[PDB]
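agent> step 3/5: call structure_predict on target 'Inositol 1,4,5-trisphosphate receptor type 1' (Rattus norvegicus).
agent> reason: downstream docking stage needs a structural representation; sequence fetched in step 2, passing through unchanged.
tool.input:
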Amino acid sequence: SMNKSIPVTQELICKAVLNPTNADILIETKLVLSREEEVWLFWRDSNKEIRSKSVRELAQDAKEGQKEDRDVLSYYRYQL
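tool.output (status=ok):
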């Protein structure tokens, strides 16, 4: 609501969005560290294949003009 919660609908959406968390990857992005350290992210394309790519690689591809990279970054920001 206007800078508030009204948690009744909040707990509905919280319970609901965790059912497609069991079926997690809509293209929902998961964050895993390198374990040298770097941040990698995982998502599944339309043809249902898992893809991985570094965040800096995404940044440089966006600066290079990749439409799928644009889509992935926009989806990631909106998910955040």
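agent> step 4/5: record observation. Strands lie at 30-33, 39-44, 50-54.
agent> proceeding.
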